[PDB]
Amino acid sequence: RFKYTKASQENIQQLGNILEQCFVMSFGDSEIYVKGIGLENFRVIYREQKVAGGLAILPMGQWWGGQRVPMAGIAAVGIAPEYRGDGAAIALIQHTLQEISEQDIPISVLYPATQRLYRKAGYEQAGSSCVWEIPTDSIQIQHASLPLEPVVLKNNPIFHELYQQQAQLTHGYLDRHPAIWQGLNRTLDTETLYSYLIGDKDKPQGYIIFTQERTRDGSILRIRDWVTLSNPAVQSFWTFIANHRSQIDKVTWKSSVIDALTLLLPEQSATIRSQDRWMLRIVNVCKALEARGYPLGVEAELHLEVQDDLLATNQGKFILSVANGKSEVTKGGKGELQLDIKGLASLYTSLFTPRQLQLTGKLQATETALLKATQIFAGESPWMIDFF
């Protein structure tokens, strides 16, 4: 009934049209998008002989406990409205997951338009994204430790190199697919993209990428990506932004829900404009657990019992043995901590603690196993700066 295939020249325009409709994109903005991602990354689902919908798979990485875990990002999931309510989206997602599994990519992440669909395939809330906003005139920091310099973003390796340093240090950050960088460098003809490095010459310590616009409400500077590796970069960031106060009414940036940059402001003038939880699917239990970093000082063996109604190789008992910041996973054990593959996603990312997952019914464990799992999976609240 539903046939899953790679996109081809024969069907990429139809899919692009379906994507424009699904996401309410202005006429033809789908070409730029599809082109930025690459046709090779798009997948199509057919219903009978007609193109019903599709998505993009972004093979990349994600930083967990400071180790890069291969990760397949799912983007632009759309089913043409005439085919909706018929199981086409879940069929698509299941096929896609099977493909990711065959590629030995152990985890997959996406921003859901609707959670029910993705939970049917084993995705679960697993990390945060948060848009903060603040009035420019409330910043009141003039501590310009480091200079700022406008630089060109496109293919500039300095940005990749600073990014990958903050990424490796931030639990949940992407090892970005080229498309993510593409999106960041993309603006309306309307608008100018501004990019600055923070630091003395040839000693960059961070960067800021932003756009500015005038709206009905007033003027806004939207920071789409930033990096601050040190406190002098943080002071310099805020100073630079505070210095836009005569030209800009409000500034927004993406951070963690418990944002640390606001620690340096004189008052709590910043607010959360919006937030989202992205979801994660544990595609391969063994490989996902073995690829992740673990805290040093932890030596524990956790005996897990996992349910996975889609990918049979993940259904069963596994012993996770952690020592020296690394794990080894073997089959078997006593299954002292039981959960569905969904519970494991939230546990894995440290979004919620074992105790919190127990309380919300996503896992059952003995107190000893609860303690071992708390020690193993403890970490900074997961987030990413990127949307896809």
Ligand X SMILES: CC(C)(COP(=O)(O)OP(=O)(O)OC[C@H]1O[C@@H](n2cnc3c(N)ncnc32)[C@H](O)[C@@H]1OP(=O)(O)O)[C@H](O)C(=O)NCCC(=O)NCCS
Site for a copy of itself (CB under 8 A): which residue of 283, 300, 344, 373? 300
| Helix axis angle, 367-377 to 341-349, nearest 10° | 50
Site for a copy of itself (CB under 8 A): which residue of 39, 131, 158, 298? 298
At 71 the three-state DSSP class reads: strand
Given a copy of itself, ligand X, none, residue 90, with its beta carbon under 5 to 8 Å by kind, binds ligand X
Given a copy of itself, ligand X, none, residue 367, with its beta carbon under 5 to 8 Å by kind, binds none
- Interacting residues of 50 by C-beta distance below 8 A, sequence separation 6+: none
Count of residues that bind ligand X according to CB under 6 A: 22
Beta bridge partners of 283: none
> Is residue 86 a contact point for ligand X (CB under 6 A)?
yes
Q: Strands 107-110 and 67-79, how do they pair?
A: parallel
> Is residue 95 a contact point for ligand X (CB under 6 A)?
no
Task: Check if the beta carbon of residue 254 is closer than 8 Å to that of residue 287.
Answer: no
Site for ligand X (CB under 6 A): which residue of 143, 222, 245, 326? 245
Site for a copy of itself (CB under 8 A): which residue of 161, 272, 313, 332? 272
> Is residue 330 a contact point for a copy of itself (CB under 8 A)?
no
- CA–CA separation, 322 vs 333, rounded Å? 15
* 89 has binding-site annotation: yes
The token duo for 336 is 């002292």
- CA–CA separation, 84 vs 195, rounded Å? 42
Residue 96: burial class (beta carbons within 10 Å; 0-12, 13-18, 19+):
buried
Q: Which of residues 63-82 bind ligand X (CB under 6 A)?
A: 76-79
- CA–CA separation, 73 vs 349, rounded Å? 15
Site for ligand X (CB under 6 A): which residue of 15, 22, 134, 270? 22
> Is residue 271 a contact point for a copy of itself (CB under 8 A)?
yes
> Is residue 360 a contact point for a copy of itself (CB under 8 A)?
yes
- CA–CA separation, 149 vs 76, rounded Å? 35
Q: Which residues bind to ligand X, rule: CB under 6 A?
A: 22, 76-79, 84-90, 112-114, 116-117, 120, 244-247
- For the annotated binding site for CoA, the residues are 77, 79, 85, 87, 89-90, 120, 267
